[PDB]
Design a protein around this ligand. Structure first.
Ligand SMILES: CC(C)=CCC/C(C)=C/CC/C(C)=C/CSP(=O)(O)OP(=O)(O)O
Lengths: 302, 306
């Protein structure tokens, strides 16, 4: 099932998402209204909210409070992105922060309008994990000595965990079985991880080399450094320590191709996508599920 | 009630609140804990959490969950400060660098997000859908308010401080009484008290900005009550100076002629009078509650505020 079949299948629910998003961002302040219009008219995949509506329908959710979860999930994501824009000694810091908070806080109100503590437990924990992940990532900047245990935790915390909570909470809302619930909870976690690994290597393939220029150690980079010639291992660690090394993309790429860092990551992402597709086997075979599997494939397609 | 009589009656709980706060900075990510320790150990004041504690007591609550609601509130407040210092580009917060000047903007903003979400986790642990409903709305009200004043009279000002300060005071006392199980009247009682106290509290803070970070509101020409009064009743010269300074969002180096204008019109004492008005309402609203030392303290704090 391709993105088009997956879009038509979600067309109606995604309208519900958009409408709930507009209702929450409908206040007097161009800056905010215009962001709502921005989000609902975005020609992007908007996979996070799609997963939320898909997960619920796959477990037979007949109502439509699942559209409110899809919406708050997108808010959590938007809010985290706005805060990720804050700069120091190097929209604007002010708008990025305040609008970010507006969206976060609004995301929490929606969480509780659902009137479910379980949902609140999970979401409440995920967002705090996400925040935690953002700080861990901040500490890792210019640090070429971080372990994979660390890194693996970075992506899980900042990307995977939100996919996990979106699938799981949609399951909870639909009062599905503990077994089914764990199917979606794992599918989100594994897909989220695959999604981030693919994202990290595409950064080497906006402008490839941003992670590099910022000194952000990602798997592709941590692998070439360890599995490479001392000549290269030094250039990489230097590039990570001083930052501003976009100019070293080729030498770094050639170091990656030499030990297959990128290929090794893509392969690692595919293990993840295959684990998420597996977790979904405990669910009734239906187009909704076919769609959730279809996303796992797309997520890792070249 | 006297301050020390309050610092003693309330002593034990506030000791718990302090611990309840510091045990939450337990992340595996050291930077969170450091920055947390950095900002939470600056003395603060802790009026928001003290109100919470006393409010629970002033309704018979014999538990220890009020210590938890009082802590998260401090966290929420803490978070707003971090985020605010990053927005106001402040490098000073009471004799010491702001958290951003020492750790950087990113670290402040993110760690602040950690703290707020943690406070939110802390509310769900209490499992009270109403608290969560009142508290979340309160925080969203504060936020929409900040995005607002990021884009010229007394009415406008009384609205600007409701979102900014009074509202969290309102939530502090109300959610504290609700968690106890107070009556619909007590709840409404504690709520107004917090709202008015918070309003009074802010009025005093604004006048304390014209000496007794002193003088920073004028530097960015913001319309606090004191300034508006001096404008309306001062000379047409002092009136033109103040207005242009506000339109300019900059009144830097004008402190002398401004204070002159204020002392002449008595703009500060008038702000103080207004503060006392709100403090009376706060006290007059605690009537519904039973006469207990706790309530005597919540009234004491109202008097101390003004
Ligand atoms: C954490 C979260 C989800 C939301 C927080 C939203 C924020 C940042 C609210 C700011 C509230 C405050 C204390 C504003 C004071 S600006 P001022 O210059 O008038 O007061 P000041 O002297 O800087 O304290």
């Amino acid at each position: 099932m391709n993105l088009e079949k997956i879009n038509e299948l979600t067309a109606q629910d995604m309208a519900g998402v958009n409408a709930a998003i507009l209702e929450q961002l409908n206040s007097d302040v161009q800056l905010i209204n215009q962001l709502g219009y921005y989000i609902v008219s975005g020609g992007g995949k908007r996979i996070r909210p799609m997963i939320a509506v898909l997960a619920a329908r796959a477990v037979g959710y007949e109502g439509n409070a699942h559209v409110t979860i899809a919406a708050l999930i997108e808010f959590i994501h938007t809010a985290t992105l706005l805060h990720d824009d804050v700069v120091d000694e190097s929209f604007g810091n002010a708008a990025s922060v305040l609008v970010g908070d507006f969206i976060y806080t609004r995301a929490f109100q929606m969480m509780t309008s659902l009137g479910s503590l379980k949902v609140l437990e999970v979401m409440s924990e995920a967002v705090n994990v996400i925040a935690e992940g953002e700080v861990l990532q901040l500490m890792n900047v210019n640090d070429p000595d971080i372990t994979e245990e660390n890194y693996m935790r970075v992506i899980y915390s900042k990307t995977a965990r939100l996919f996990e909570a979106a699938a799981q909470c949609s399951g909870i809302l639909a009062g599905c079985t503990p077994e089914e619930e764990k199917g979606l909870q794992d599918y989100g976690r594994y897909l989220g991880t695959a999604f981030q690994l693919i994202d990290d290597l595409l950064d080497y393939n906006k402008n490839v080399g941003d992670d590099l220029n910022e000194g952000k150690p990602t798997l592709p980079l941590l692998h070439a450094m360890h599995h490479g010639t001392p000549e290269q291992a030094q250039m990489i660690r230097t590039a990570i320590e001083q930052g501003n090394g976009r100019h070293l993309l080729e030498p770094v790429l050639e170091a990656m191709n030499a030990c297959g860092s990128l290929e090794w990551t893509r392969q690692r992402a595919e293990e993840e996508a295959d684990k998420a597709i597996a977790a979904l086997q405990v669910l009734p075979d239906t187009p909704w599920r076919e769609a959730l599997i279809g996303l796992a494939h797309i997520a890792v397609q070249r």
